[PDB]
Amino acid sequence: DAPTIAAEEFEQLMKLASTGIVPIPPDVLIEASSLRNKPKLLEMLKQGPSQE
């Protein structure tokens, strides 16, 4: 019993990543989350390397 599909998606992703056998990058976790600052976190993580 979960509210939406993204709920089970995020729960299963967290359960899989807690074991550490399979490595999940943080951007997928942010996208699957239900946060209010999702665009801000996605912009912060998707930025490229510094010019220097």
Add this chain to the structure above:
Amino acid sequence: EIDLLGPNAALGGKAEGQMSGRAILAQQQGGMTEAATYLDRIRALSIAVYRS
């Protein structure tokens, strides 16, 4: 008889929160099973009021 009829007021009234943002009623041990119908009625009324 009347004491047995009523529920237990000690282990009750706790709301647990998951990572999905939905509030799940943690019933702990027995006692909340009898009041589950009452809580479901309250939840249904709240949902209808929110939709309206």
Add this chain to the structure above:
Amino acid sequence: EIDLLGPNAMSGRAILAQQQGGMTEAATYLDRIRALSIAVYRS
């Protein structure tokens, strides 16, 4: 009867259970106090 009706009064766990039940029953009284306080703050 009057002792049982009150929020507090054996064994030791019975007293804790009675206190928790009294708190649960007096949740309504505390909610009334909170509502009065909120109205006073708003005014």
